[PDB]
Amino acid sequence: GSMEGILDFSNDLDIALLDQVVSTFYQGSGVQQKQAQEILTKFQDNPDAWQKADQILQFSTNPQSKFIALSILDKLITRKWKLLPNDHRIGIRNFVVGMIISMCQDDEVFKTQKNLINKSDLTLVQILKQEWPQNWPEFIPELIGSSSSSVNVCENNMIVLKLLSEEVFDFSAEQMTQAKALHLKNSMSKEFEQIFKLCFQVLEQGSSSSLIVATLESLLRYLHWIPYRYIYETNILELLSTKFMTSPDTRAITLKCLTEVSNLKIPQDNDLIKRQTVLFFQNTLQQIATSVMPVTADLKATYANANGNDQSFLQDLAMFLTTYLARNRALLESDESLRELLLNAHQYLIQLSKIEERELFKTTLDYWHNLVADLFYEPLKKHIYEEICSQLRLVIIENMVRPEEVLVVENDEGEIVREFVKESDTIQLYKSEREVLVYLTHLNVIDTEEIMISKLARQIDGSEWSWHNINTLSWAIGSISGTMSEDTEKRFVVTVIKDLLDLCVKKRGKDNKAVVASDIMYVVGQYPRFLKAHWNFLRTVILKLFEFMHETHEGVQDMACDTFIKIVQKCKYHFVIQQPRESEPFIQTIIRDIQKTTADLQPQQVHTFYKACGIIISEERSVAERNRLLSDLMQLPNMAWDTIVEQSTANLLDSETVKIIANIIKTNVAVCTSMGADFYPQLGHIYYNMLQLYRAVSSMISAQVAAEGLIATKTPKVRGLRTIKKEILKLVETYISKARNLDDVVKVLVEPLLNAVLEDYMNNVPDARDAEVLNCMTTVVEKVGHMIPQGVILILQSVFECTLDMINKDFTEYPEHRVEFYKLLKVINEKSFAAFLELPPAAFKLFVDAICWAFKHNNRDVEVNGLQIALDLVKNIERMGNVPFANEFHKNYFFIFVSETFFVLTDSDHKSGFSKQALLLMKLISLVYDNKISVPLYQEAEVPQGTSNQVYLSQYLANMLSNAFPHLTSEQIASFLSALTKQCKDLVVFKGTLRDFLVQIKEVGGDPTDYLFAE
Template identity: 50%
Template sequence: MSVNLVDNFDINLLDNVVKTFFNSTNVNERSEANKVLMHFQQNPDSWKRVDSILDQSNFMQTKFIALQILESLIKTMWKVLPIEQRQGIRTFVVAQIIKVSSDDAAMEKNKTYLSKLNLVLVQILKQDWPANWPQFIPEIVQSSKSNLALCENNMVILKLLSEEIFDFSAEQMTQEKTKNLKNQMCGEFSEIFQLCFEILEKAAKPSLIKTTLETLLKFLNWIPLGYIFETNLITILIERFLGNELALFRNPTLKCLTEIGSLRVGAEYNERFVKLFIMVMEVIQKLIPVDQDLMSIYDNANDEDQEFIQNLALFLTTFLWSHLKAVEGMVPSIPAAGQCLNIAHIYLIRISQIKERELFKICIEYWAKMVQSLFEEIQAVPPADPLLNHNQANRITHQQLHRKHNYVAILSRLRVVMIERMVKPEEVLIVENDEGEIVREFIKESDTIVVYKSMKEILVYLTHLDTEDTERIMIDKLTLQMDEKEFTWERLNTLCWAIGSISGAMNEEVEKRFLVSVIKDLLGLCEVRRGKDNKAVVASNIMYVVGQYPRFLKAHWKFLKTVVNKLFEFMHESHEGVQDMACDTFIKIAQKCRRHFVMQQPNEVMPYIEEILQNIQTITNDLTPSQVHTFYEAVGHMISAQPTKIVQDRLIQKCMEIPNGFWDSQMQQARVNANVLEDSVNIKILGNIMKTNVSACSSIGSPFFIQIQRIYLDLLSLYKAVSGLISSSVASQGEVATKTPRVRGMRTIKKEILKLVEIYIQKAEDLPTVNANLIPPLLEAILLDYRQNVEDARDAEVLSVMATIFTRLEGLMSDKVAGVFDAVFECTLQMISRNFEDFPEHRVAFYKMLHALNGHCFNALLSLPPQPFKLYMDSIIWGIKHSMRDISDMGLQICSDMFDNFSKMPPVVSFKLQSQILMKMFKTVEDNLIEAKLYNPTQVTNPNLSNRDYLKEYVCGLLQNAFPHLTPNQILQFVTGLFELSKDYNAFKNHLRDFLISLKEFAGNDLMLDEREAEAKKLKEEQLKQALLIPGMVKPSER
């Protein structure tokens, strides 16, 4: 398709191109059509064809493209157009709107087109009103009285204008412009309000009324309060529309009342808000009687009625949160307020029972705030003096507790709802990792967990407000589960999750009685329920509940031991999920009660950890490898609590006995037969041994050195051997070898070795020993391997380990920085600098390493030769430009930290480095490599500034304030030079130095340091050259 619409414009041809783009099934045709359209749209004169297109085109999509062109012109070029052209465009757009919106049939037919025209008009208004279109409001109000269809569309335009000014302005207009438009809108609002009020009071056309209600909704959060409270607006909304037999009006009306109810103003309006609340509740009771089952109504309702229930929830929660205390305060003088308050909370209880997640979230947000306020009120009451029964303190207590007593029945019903609807405390995904292994992944911030946290808070507050009622409801519900008709997995799960959620909310004695009763009933339930599945569900819930009450377990050793032994039994249970739950509960208990396992308990022969370690093979023999790793991590938590080093070392050795046995066997086989690593079974065994070490090390921490020391040399030998095999596979099969199960398994071994070393170094306490004994052989094993491997076989974990080493060992690594840099830096940069997508893990780890170098080995960094240091600086600047947010943020942070480090150095040393950074930053802006704006558009006079112009203005202003004795022209010349010379370091540095010298703040000699050093080096080289001509003049060590 060779078409040029710019030079040879033809409406029919344009329509055909647009039709091809939208309708053709041929990919090449669509691509060519897109190129033609893009070329046409990007032409600076294409807007001049818009009127012809809108008048003559027969294809609606073509008109939309024309309106996009026009909208772009208005947003970017409007102010530079001659006034005649602007008025012409404005008149044309208004005429098009009137043409399409003058009767209902045309409006319905061209609904989408009219919406786009309205948006274009609003963009013109943002530019021209009020200065160049002062009569807009009177004109639109007057035209609304001539035609009902036109009036309806005018309401849409006013709604869009309000949204642009009051809702969306922060991102699109300067603060000053927004302020002016808001003032103008408020100043001329009386005419708009009069029009809206007249429509709501008298109009009969349903679509016009609905549109006016939707427009009014956008006004309510900013109009003066007099329009709301000093007129009959509220009465009209409630009496004419909320209870109207036409459901069409109910939702927009309730939204308007919600907006009014959200207003927080002076106490003088309290009575009016209370009367509004009473009027609304009276109508709601007629629409939905309070005793009806809202859950059934919602399930069988149409979309509009479901939306009404959601809007009712929003009205109740919004109004009550804003005015609850005002309503409570009016109860003595207006008794109906108390009745309506109770009814409103009953509605919320019933809405909370509806099984619709988003609706439930609306409700629990209010319930959380309400119960928290009741709890905090009680906490604020001073303790009563029992010797003074009639003192002031007791009167205050009675008065302040009165609010809680008003809601006893509601709070009791709320407890039932929260218990019955409790969600799962944590979510676990079963996923396949990069090495093809199936692993469990805990999700930390899913929607379910957010809801769980809110519900837990509500139940904790409810427990504090009435412990006895909470306990009674939970025990009664648990008793009901003994009845076969009442028992379901879902009911038992939600009940046990709720029981677990209130751990610590009761005092210790009450909690003890409660938990003993719960466990007793659950064990009884396990006995009476038939079927393996049922028993497994009950067993899982027993484990979950006991795992949530560490305080009770710590205080009752025998019970704790019984629980753990029961968990060990469940670890042999084959029912899906039971072993996972047993391991998860075991590690939670191990974390919370770790000391109790290493102590000598009364009437025990030995600390329980000894017994666990003796039976570790028996306990774990039915677990999957990932479950075994969880078990070892749990045991590690216990061992970490042992205070005596000799005993702790013995426990670690005993703990690692089984994996060390397999390890020794594998190492022995490898020494005899190098092909042992060709066997996939052996690869899997070694991978699991490493993961077991990682798990134990992560919880034991620094004392794990005794195990690291035992296997370290073999560990590094294995790393080298596996690397060699991977390289051989890649050499023989190509890079596809890295995707094969065998190579992926070997890479797992490498990664786990690196992870083990990293975790240990993170937790190590004796850093000099780590530096002396662990680092040299580690670097020798991993660095050369990393550099020589093909890109797909390089492990990002190497970079991550180096970042951790630099962070922890700091100055101890100074002599090794250059070697590390040489091995990993340039080859990684080549991998990640080709684009912004490949090797994402390497990117993140690489910048973590750069950050660690800058933060912890800065002096060593400065000692790098010029070329590597330049690479380091280039990497930071490239990181700042990165499309991945976390990497660009890290690049900026490194840059910021580097400036902080420079500021602590004398100017003599830091000038060269600072000038290099400045040059790169100015070059980045000069070359327009940063797409995002460097400034907030709302805080500058011209939101269309380029980054270059903004930075130029900003730096000029900064320097003018810092050095007021300089003329604006001097500063402008200097700043212009910073941009123009940013491609030539020597010229840039000299320009910067000349400016500093002119300020007389630094001595010129100091800034010539680079040149003087270079000159001295050159002289020394010439002297050495001359001396070498004379035999014996120069020592061998000096040559």
């Protein structure tokens, strides 16, 4: 292509050809645009490209070309500024400064090229970070002086100052060393008094508005750090709160400026600063009432219409009111003359809380929580806000979001149906609405009941009947559970149920009856205290849920199962005892009908039902009775199990038989999840045959892979067979993680388990290995690892080397095996470190390779465990004392861990694990500077005899860093290691020195004295 001509630097640069590539990229499309993009990238990334920056600037008409020219300068100024001759530096400063002035004097350019001007200002600010003030002490006075000349220069200087403030105070932490950040902050601080005068004069002597807005935009940044006196000891609060609130083009930024002021913890003693903090709020609320809208305005409707900036302003108003009031509302709560201001501000927030905008509602909801929590404790305050809180009760109730328990929703067709997915992003909102509404109910429980009862009354008679109105009301009724007295709760709940019952009977329709069903289920499920005290009602509820388990509406059916177990988790005790006027504990009635009750349920719903029964059974503490109940509950799956066994012992191939087996195991898992240690008798009933079945299905899977290939693993048959193996493992993992008798686990379970799973895992092909084996072994080692030292060895032999070969070719394949692998190594390294001492030297080398391999993952699940294993391994070795194995470990692997930890610290691709990388590195360095390593870390020849490991460690690291970062000077490296070494007992300072180093390796000429920042 001809567009590639600009890549050849022997020839001069044809600026005309440059603009064509630029235009082809920004205004082109298709392949042309894609080709020009790749060209401009190669041009920009050329180390000599900057030398043609002034050339492009002068003779080019395309402003995008000049923008990319400044992007090349910014890149040079940032990383290679100090590598230039002192003449190229001043020259670059000259035609950057000269360019800015040249553009601000041409009124046409200044109006149309705001992008190129802002980019040029930002480029100048990069020079300032490098040169100012040590090599440019008159920049600020000359900036102030030049402002009085052209109105366009003054405005553009406000942009420069805004950006400088940002780069020094708002974005310096990640981009500068501590020393340089402090130097620039002190510099701007020392010269700010003059900056403020220019900014205050402009604001008072009004001007080109756009200059006023630019000045206010700069003030917004100053307010992040400047002393309080500049705010309260001048007339600026009055300017902001009155003058600049009137004009709408300054109102946005002014309101943001006042929000920043509002969020300052002011001296709690000065009475005058309190008057000023009151005054600017008074003025601000006055300007809004008169210039924008009164407190009665329908902000819900204004926001919906979205005229101009109304949505942005209403958001900013909400931020200002909530920010100020959360900090200073106590200033308004005593003085009677300020009561109206206090209530009008909150009345605006009431109106703001009616806007239909989730994120905005959360912002105001956060404030309401702040307020009602304060009124819940602070004496004599809630009466002030009585009327506000009544309105808020209405807002919250009418805007309740659907709880996660409610599984039915209206679709675009107008039908009530089941939910496709969960509404994961409304879960937090519901909790927040509940918290606030619970507080509001404690503050006036009578007012809340009156609202809800009458709202309910207007649902029976149909005044306000709608699905939305009954839903939000029901959700609110359920969400305040626990706020009322038992007796009030009775009368209340009784009233609600009666009218919800009436409402069902009353309503024709498939959909009406599904809505009212979900709402009744949610309310009753939310009031267990009431159910416990009314057995007759509890029984009726449960039986109705059993009826719903037969309804053809999927949502209602699924919700009946979740409500059932939700009630059981709280009321289990009332199912195990024999209630008055009952012939048997209700658990026996449930069990005896379990087949017909669950007949129409889906399998996972049946399992939930069994788990619920398991919860109940675990309340019976008479062993004989519990085991009997457990035996009764499992009677159906145990009869199917026994039938399956006889057949299995005749060579399972049936897809329907595999599904049956899987559901039997899943039922045992469900019951074991809720019974834990109590499940042991049922486990022992099936354990031996279950493990034989594990072996049988394994042979089938292997035989299938052999006859059909790896693709067999994708077939429904093989996947069905592996489900069996996974549920078996999950069942054993579930029990062992809850077992209380570890002697039986060791002497009964562990031995057959390892024989059944380990060799199968090892001798299957990679694609046939189940990562669930690793997960099961982790639990075994966690719980009884200390009792089976030889068992742990056998686990390593079987899974370590073959799993490592699966995951040490890239970071993506076998992601589950990857994660479970390092969870297993972690627990072994913690609970049974002896197993690693038995590894042959070659296998212990792979173990170290495996840990370092974990370091280099971006996956947090692997990375965090990799760094933890390394840390714990170093501790384990240190504990051993001065013995041969500990000595050999350091000689072999100390510097491997130091250099590897360093590599991931500096490669910019593992930012997420910096803290633990630092911790690991600090421990390794401290071992040497506490003489915890008894043998020398060097060779016989490398170093004179008797040289301390401290000396050699500094020499090793100085050489390592010199070759890995050759652009650093020897003094930078020496200063860095000296600081890093002195600070190996203070993690916070240690981490600061490492962060300073990560900054300096990104540029040339870093100041080596920056590493003395702590000293």
